[PDB]
Amino acid sequence: MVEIDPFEMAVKQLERAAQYMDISEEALEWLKKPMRIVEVSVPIEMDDGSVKVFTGFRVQHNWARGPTKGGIRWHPAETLSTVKALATWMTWKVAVVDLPYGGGKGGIIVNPKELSEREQERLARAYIRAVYDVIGPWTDIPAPDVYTNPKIMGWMMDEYETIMRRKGPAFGVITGKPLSIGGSLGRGTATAQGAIFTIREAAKALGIDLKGKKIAVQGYGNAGYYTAKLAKEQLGMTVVAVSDSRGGIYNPDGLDPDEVLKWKREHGSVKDFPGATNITNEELLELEVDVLAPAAIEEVITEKNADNIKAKIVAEVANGPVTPEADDILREKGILQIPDFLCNAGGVTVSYFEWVQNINGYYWTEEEVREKLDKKMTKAFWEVYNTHKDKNIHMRDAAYVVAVSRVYQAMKDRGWVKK
Template identity: 40%
Template sequence: MSENQQYSFFESVLRSFDKAARFTSWDPGILEQIKACNSVYRMKFPVKIGDSVEVIEAYRVQHSHHKTPCKGGIRFSMEVNQDEVMALAALMTYKCAIVNVPFGGGKGGIKIDPKRYTPYELEKITRRYTAELIKKNFIGPGTDVPAPDYGTGAREMAWILDTYVAMHPGEVDAAACVTGKPVSQGGVRGRTEATGLGVFYGIREICNMPDVMEKLGLSVGMKDKTVVVQGLGNVGYHSAKFFREGGAKVIAIAEWEGAIFNADGLNEEEVFQHRKTTGTILNFPGSTNLAINTDALELECDILIPAALENVINNVNAPKVKAKIIGEAANGPLTPEADEILSAKGTLVVPDMYLNAGGVTVSYFEWLKNLSHVRYGRMEKRFTENMNKHILGQIEDLTGKQVSESERKFIEHGADEVDLVHSGLEETMITATREIMDIWKSNPEIPDMRTAAYISAINKVATSYAELGIFP
């Protein structure tokens, strides 16, 4: 084990929890209950792969039942183990609490390398896993609602849904047993870009706080802020896109094969297409290649967005990180040692547990859509458009002036599903950011934003337990 990983992932979550718990006045017993994983289901099941039978190892953890259903993704990876799934389930509890999404934390994983299997074999594994979850009542619209994670996507969620429906004929809310589904199967528009957009909304809100910007020596607002993004997967790509569209300059993008730099800014879609054509982001026209991909983490910039792997910033490279703000788009990109080093340097680390909550927030909207059986915007879109047209017509008649065609389209537009999903996500991220910053400012002894975020989560979960009457 390297010196940066002397303890397990779950232990590092507990360390962060304990650090924050001392700033609360809850009974130690309540704190112990919040920390504990309520249910851990470890299973092994056989699946016929080709001519042989493989025994598959899989997990589902329900961390907290202070609110139900439990919510959390399912990952397909050879790295899956009980400790990791428990840690991620715990983080889901705190994440949902911080952004006021009424779920308990859950997480699932199947220990396979999805690249080794055909789609048909993956379908067999996914359906068998779902059947195992159903047997033990570890899935259901009001019990436990999975979602995509590493190695899974809308396709796997559709298989889970179909298996659940087949085993629960006539259950009217069955579509709400899983989120991240294809739109045609009850999924919600706006889910794909949700995490990256949430990262942007969270960082933008911080950049709009004059006192925070003054402390960091930065101007207020997003305009012309320099951004470095590590990872060009779904989260990295969409983070880069929204930062660029929001007026910032993405000066570097890093992937596993290397990193590229351009002081005038990069367009993530052009880089993505270049990589699709050539198999690498390197040698992108107009950019400079960096020798090692991790060099991008040490570039001079205002905002650094690690959106790929865990533990990429550690006690070795943290002293060389020059970014004023680090937005944790990935899960756990900083080790606890890196946290201490950066905090001492005055770097603002915006923690993953709330910053990448866009995915679960929009999953919540999908769950609500499935329970209500109606698409967002369907009831009011035309009414709003007709009303806006009427108001605009009246104003034009009274003033004798006409608005431009582009302005007319904008004013008359009635909200569609994706507009409402983005609006709900923006409201969620702004509210959560302000709540965390208020907690941090309320006590000068709170060392960093991560601790403030944990305090927010602990207070909300503990309040739920207390109000349920579980603790006198």
């Protein structure tokens, strides 16, 4: 009994969410299996004049609401139980903000730091020719993810425009494109502006004046850097500690993220930054801040580091930062914590706004996008917040209640489930 299946863990969270609601037992077995899995063979021609064949997947979970939406991963540790896990995870993220979308994910088993520039062109174009049968502007809409760039999503668009012969809105087949091929403004700061909005609305309900409190960030990714910065410019937070894979620093007087990022682009890591103390990743989690925002890795909170954490808000930004073993041990502490797929929902809503502009054909302005981003993210938090205070459940579990009940209500109306 020594095993951890990544897909079967994503089913066992759905069975836990079937007890806080009244759902039919004939539709509960529908959401445990994705509806159309493709596993294509993707041949590229190398630089040496030889041919290699990589395995590429495409998993569409549930299109009951509309088209399906999901990113594309390039990683050598890919499996079918890792794509089917995130594909059944994407449907509870695009339902909770009430978008007409369904889940999905795709991936290729490749290592992208051992392919040159002209070899990535012959892989990203060769992935589209193999799954053209199951994508489209109204069927399946890809997106960028780990080890993909918006440079690459421009290439997949061009190989779609050559197959379709331009008989349709070909700019809407993919989001996260560059600015001058049919992309949207305000896209690079989506997951930051999605997170910092949910930090404000939670703390306004917790009733703490943030203009004078502090914050700590574990990890220094691109969504990790702007999380600290847009808490300083817009919110008013004091960023006191950062970290990465090597080490971490801490300063009790605020650290300006522009000068800090100039260090990490210069040296190997954040080590020996002036006006701080070079510390570790474990002691950073038990610091003293107003809100802890993990955004680096998964399952950093386990059973042995559970009750040492000293914070008021745990902004779940990364994909499942807390294990279910330690969520209840922190629940009795009186710690309000917005969930994982309610904080990073900003990366989908701005990705939805690039799909609206490409279908109609009329591109919006920058502030008009960022003004409608609050309307989605503040409303979708208050629909969860009133549910939690009236049913006495953890907000990790309370978000799953409205997420299934929007999808199950659409499966009952398309005739898919009678009971």
